[PDB]
């Protein structure tokens, strides 16, 4: 998303209670809008929390942080969604699965998205790749989804540290590899010169 961010933020700053409550149902039922981080952090939408339209804010929280199974567990409280919105939330659940692991079996996908047959799932993954949400390829025989690239959904202000926790884990990793080379290169010289020196001793005994 990018154009829709500005286009709906313009309307978000110029909207009130009920108009915002219906705007939430309009942003979730719109193609391309898979991130709601700027929209959920608005004071105008913060007013809707713990108010007359609380379930809509909870629905936006599920769409920005939770999965389709989390929606199914709280479907009695949350407002009803159409097939397009249910699909979108399923796409985002596949993104969460893809964020966890690279190779996703069909069983875990069928259980997490609440699907009955394989083609439904395959068609949803196609709809994902076609909406530029996921990249990858499907394997029928081994019944597995090979994920090449998945987008970012969750913002997580409190759990942000975890990102750094992995980034540092990569940094340290680099810092090992780098030093490794520095040492190995040094060794590669340490041998060479030594050997040359040794040869120069052998060659000095030819005169005797």
């Amino acid at each position: 998303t990018g154009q829709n961010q500005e286009q709906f933020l313009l309307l978000a700053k110029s909207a009130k209670g009920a108009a915002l409550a219906t705007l939430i149902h309009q942003v979730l039922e719109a193609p391309g809008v898979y991130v709601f981080g700027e929209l959920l952090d608005m004071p105008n939408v913060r007013e809707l929390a713990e108010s007359d339209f609380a379930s809509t804010f909870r629905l936006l929280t599920v769409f920005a942080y939770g999965t389709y199974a989390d929606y199914l567990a709280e479907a009695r409280n949350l407002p009803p969604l159409t097939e397009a919105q249910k699909n979108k939330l399923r796409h985002l659940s596949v993104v969460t699965l893809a964020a966890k692991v690279k190779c996703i079996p069909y069983a875990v996908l069928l259980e997490a998205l609440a699907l009955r047959n394989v083609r439904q799932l395959e068609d949803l993954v196609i709809e994902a790749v076609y909406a530029d949400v996921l990249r990858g390829s499907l394997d029928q025989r081994n019944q597995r989804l090979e994920v090449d690239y998945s987008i970012g959904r969750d913002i997580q202000r409190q759990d942000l540290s975890a990102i750094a926790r992995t980034l540092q884990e990569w940094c340290v990793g680099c810092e090992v590899v780098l030093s490794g080379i520095e040492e190995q290169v040094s060794r590669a010289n340490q041998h060479k010169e030594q050997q040359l020196g040794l040869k120069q001793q052998i060659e000095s005994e030819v005169a005797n």
Partner: protein, 298 residues
Amino acid sequence: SIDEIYKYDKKQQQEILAAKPWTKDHHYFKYCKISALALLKMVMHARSGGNLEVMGLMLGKVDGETMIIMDSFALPVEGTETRVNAQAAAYEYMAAYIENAKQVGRLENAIGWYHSHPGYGCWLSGIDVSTQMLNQQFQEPFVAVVIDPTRTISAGKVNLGAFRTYPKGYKPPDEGPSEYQTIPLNKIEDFGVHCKQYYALEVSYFKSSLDRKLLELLWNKYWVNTLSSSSLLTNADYTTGQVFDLSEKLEQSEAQLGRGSEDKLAKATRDSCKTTIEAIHGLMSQVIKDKLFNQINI
């Protein structure tokens, strides 16, 4: 001044061509300066030929004992390495190319010829020596550049040589270190026959101030390509071809020990060493990639 070398002085070139100091000394030309553009174009052309020899012409100039290559261009010729003066078939094309180049501000004229030796090292064969001797007899000042694109890739270092022939009957002086290269058995006989009929120039490279700037800025993104090289499988067939040769070399070195050329086993050992060292370097890059991108986890 980094860009001073790019200035073309036509009268100065005419003065040097009228003076002909190379006639006073057969070792007159000692250095070969190649532009980054010409190097890249010749290596790119050489790689584009694959396992087949290609050739082209080099545009440039002379400056004291130094031959300067500014640009190069491919010739649409058959029989590189089999035909003496194969370039001759492109005479017409060379005349038109240069004419058209002059129309767009390429002022430098023919300074030499380049051709590739895919997977068999930089040196001059019998055919190459006849070709270069012709060129030095009728087109002087002229230089012969040879590139091995396959070994460039496998060694991770540019494999290029610049050579000039000796006139018929003339003997080289005492000093000849000769930097060693593995020559395959199907080429080694001809190599040995003609290796003393020419000498190697000291090669160096140059780039402009803008090239310098642009290559630093290119590197700011081109680093990604160095950590995704995959060199072990790009030209695998080369190392397997070399091993075949190495095996037949070892067969000959075994025949030498059988009953009873100067120590074939030591040569074969240095060949097997070089091939293996290249292979291990490939694995080094692969393991480095595995250490950086795979061993991270959640």
